[PDB]
Design a protein around this ligand. Sequence first.
Ligand SMILES: N[C@H](CO)COP(=O)(O)O
Ligand SMILES: [Ca+2]
Ligand SMILES: [Ca+2]
Ligand SMILES: [Ca+2]
Ligand SMILES: [Ca+2]
Ligand SMILES: [Ca+2]
Ligand SMILES: [Ca+2]
Lengths: 132, 132
Amino acid sequence: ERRGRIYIQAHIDREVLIVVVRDAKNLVPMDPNGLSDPYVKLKLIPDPKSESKQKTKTIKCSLNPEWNETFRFQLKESDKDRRLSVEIWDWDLTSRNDFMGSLSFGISELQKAGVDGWFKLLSQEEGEYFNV
Amino acid sequence: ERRGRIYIQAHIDREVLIVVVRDAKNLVPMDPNGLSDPYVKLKLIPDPKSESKQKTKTIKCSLNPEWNETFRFQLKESDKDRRLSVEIWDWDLTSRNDFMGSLSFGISELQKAGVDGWFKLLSQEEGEYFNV
Ligand SMILES: N[C@H](CO)COP(=O)(O)O
Ligand SMILES: [Ca+2]
Ligand SMILES: [Ca+2]
Ligand SMILES: [Ca+2]
Ligand SMILES: [Ca+2]
Ligand SMILES: [Ca+2]
Ligand SMILES: [Ca+2]
């Protein structure tokens, strides 16, 4: 568990993905002060023009952010071949935000069973394929 | 020690920085296969146009690379206000290489005493300032 963990809750209502991003523990420091400014980015991938994107607020200087935010996604046919992508990023003022941890759930699999618990954060490339 | 450690040897011999990049342990996975393709990038910073850049070879699929490569840098007056920047990157074929760990030593401080040992890898922004 090199990048910490995040507590996610996600299930499908009808054709509506409901995602709850509660909190995260032991995130990796990304700033010179030894901390980071975490915010989570949710997308349905593959997504070209990044048309699905939704973000939580940014928590400043914390390696254990608590967001408690809910998000709704209106699904479609095509989405059955997509994955719910959850990525944590470190907000920076004077530079590209830095990647911190990733995770993803197959939409086809969420329709069969929702999720509610802690997940180990993976690397960005790795997180677009699995969840642990 | 979230990103593992690297064994560095560096000292100055009459205006010449000699850096030995031996090996690294417990690097963080950066690829879908659960590994990474580490290579170290050495620069003297600030160095906007990267005229300083020098790289080790890339070791494929390893979180414990052994490089054993020596590098020489011809110092100057100005370099007394610069730092030796050591960054490990994960080589990727189909995408921007991913950052793995960073570290830096003040050139002014190396002139007073060289280093030879293990160093904890820091985040990129953090690594441009310290060396734990
Ligand atoms: N530029 C960063 C990329 O991850 C953050 O961007 P964004 O706020 O659009 O998610
Ligand atoms: Ca940062
Ligand atoms: Ca930041
Ligand atoms: Ca940044
Ligand atoms: Ca990679
Ligand atoms: Ca790679
Ligand atoms: Ca990449």
